[PDB]
Amino acid sequence: GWASETAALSETATPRITIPLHELAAMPKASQRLLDDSAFDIETW
Amino acid sequence: MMLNEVTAVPGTALPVAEFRDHLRLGTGFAGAEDAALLSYLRAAIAAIEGRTAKALISRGFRLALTAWRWGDMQTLPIAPVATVTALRLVDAAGVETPVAAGWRLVPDMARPRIEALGAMLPMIPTGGRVEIDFTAGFGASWSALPVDLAQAVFLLAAQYYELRHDGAAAMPFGVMALIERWRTVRVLGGRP
Amino acid sequence: MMLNEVTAVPGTALPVAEFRDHLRLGTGFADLGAEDAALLSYLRAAIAAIEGRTAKALISRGFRLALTAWRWGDMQTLPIAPVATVTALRLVDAAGVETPVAAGWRLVPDMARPRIEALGAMLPMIPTGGRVEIDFTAGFGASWSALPVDLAQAVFLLAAQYYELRHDGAAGAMPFGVMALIERWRTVRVLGGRP
Amino acid sequence: RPRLNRLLVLEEAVRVADGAGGHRLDWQAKGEVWAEVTAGSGSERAGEFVTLASVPFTIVVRAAPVGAARRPRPEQRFREGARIFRILAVAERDREGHYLSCFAREEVVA
């Protein structure tokens, strides 16, 4: 505020968002027989 | 720190008619005039508003104190507060200049406190101590009270009526067991 | 520090007409006044009994605090608690010739510790071999209707036991008895020390 | 010591004499006194041609010197509304003399 010479200026205006951090889940099912006979890395694909 | 009240309660707001319905009604004889009964309810309101630090009829107070405790505080002693009227800030002689900004009343039954905005609270001149007028209490009538606090007034004003001097005679929810939950529980006996 | 009072309670300010209705004496007789010198004689003996346990004043008579040396540097707590409008601070010398001094003393009004609180960092100096008389009117209100009612009920509970038993005869106190009503008007001090 | 809880109207009858040596009773009210009333064992009593219903009713008032209106005399009676308590005697309960024993009957005609 524009302080006058003899005003005895008073106190002025002093100046939280939460991020819950959710969870994203994937659980693909695969037969054990398949993970042994296929030529492709079904573990990695 | 004085805390005198502005105006006393009129007596037309006290239930002198509902007290004798507690006192002798249903069981008894359908005894004393209204000036004898009303001298016993306000002698039982002032015994419970002193033990529980309450007000119960919501009259107006004036708290005039000379130094604030913190700069974001000064809890008010009379507990149920609403609508702090003015924050007068007198000087020595006192042309009596009020302030109208800087603080927020926080209505709270635990710590009714005055909590200025930011970090600075209105300071006090040399000799010119600050006064707060506030209107603390439950409601303007008697029907706005908590009923267990209003019952313990009737259980106590019927004690001051039915036995005159300090003579002889504890029930489960007595006088003490009803006002034990309206009392102020503080464990600071320290510096701050 | 003597602390004698200037004037006493006039006796017309005591509620004998209400203390008579408290005692359940009698209503419509042609006598109705046989104990006015007695019912008032135990109200003065129960007010002054509670003024000694609570250090209160209850009728707001005028006091005089005649002392010879200031206790601390600036504050000088007054014994009687509810104070208002200290009338005169005079500063006497060796023999009479009292001169009133505005003196920069100011009287913080508070029912916790009623003190003077010198504003010029020192109380006004006392002459060698001279007194200081603080004249003040301490108490709640001028009439009986201005008292706090819990303290005024303890006067009626106590003056009725001086009425109903004359010699010291032993009498279980009631939840809010005589002692339980004045025990929030007592002075709670924990300093036995030098300052 | 007594708990003086009940309000009783003391009544003295002014005694206007008639011609034949007797008096006439009208029972104007004297002042009101506070007193506790303690019932004894009550039962019917053969009246004149009535079946009365009496109870002992010891009544405790505060005391007074004998030349005062606050002393109930045995020619007086109490009255709580329309319940006539007679007075049989007064007898000075305490050793110090603070309270009295009135004795009533309160005989309704049943």
Describe this structure in words.
- The structure is cut from a larger assembly and holds 1 copy of chain A (about 45 residues), 2 copies of chain B and 1 copy of chain D (about 110 residues).
- Helices cover about 10% and strands about 0% of the residues of chain A.
- Chain A has one helix at about 35.
- Chain B is an alpha+beta fold and about 190 residues long.
- Helix content of chain B is about 25%, strand content about 15%.
- Chain B is built from 4 helices and 5 strands.
- The longest helix of chain B has 18 residues, at about 35-50.
- Chain D is an all-beta fold and about 110 residues long.
- Chain D has a single domain, classed as Thrombin, subunit H (Beta Barrel).
- Chain D has strands spanning about 5-10, 15, 25, 30-40, 45, 50-55, 60, 75-80, 85, 100-105.
- In chain D, the strands form 3 sheets. Chain D has a 6-stranded antiparallel sheet with strand order 9-8-1-4-7-10, with no helix packed on it. A two-stranded antiparallel sheet of chain D has the order 2-3.
- In chain D, a hairpin with a 2-residue loop joins β8 (about 75-80) and β9.
- Chain D is globular.
- The relative contact order of chain D is 0.26.
Structural class computed from helices and strand pairing of chain D: mainly beta
Main β-sheet, spatial strand arrangement of chain B: 1-2-5-3-4
Shape of chain B: elongated
Query: Could you tell me the strand content of chain D as a percent range?
Result: over 45%
Q: Spatial order of the strands in the main sheet of chain D?
A: 9-8-1-4-7-10
Distance between the termini of chain B: 17 Å
Organism (chain B): Rhodobacter capsulatus (strain ATCC BAA-309 / NBRC 16581 / SB1003)
Protein name (chain B): Gene transfer agent protein
Organism (chain D): Rhodobacter capsulatus (strain ATCC BAA-309 / NBRC 16581 / SB1003)
Protein name (chain D): Head-tail adaptor protein
Please tag this protein with its features:
part of a larger assembly, 4 chains, A: 45 residues, little secondary structure, 9% helix, 0% strand, rod-shaped, B: 192 residues, alpha+beta, 4 helices, 5 strands, elongated, Phage_CHP (chain C)
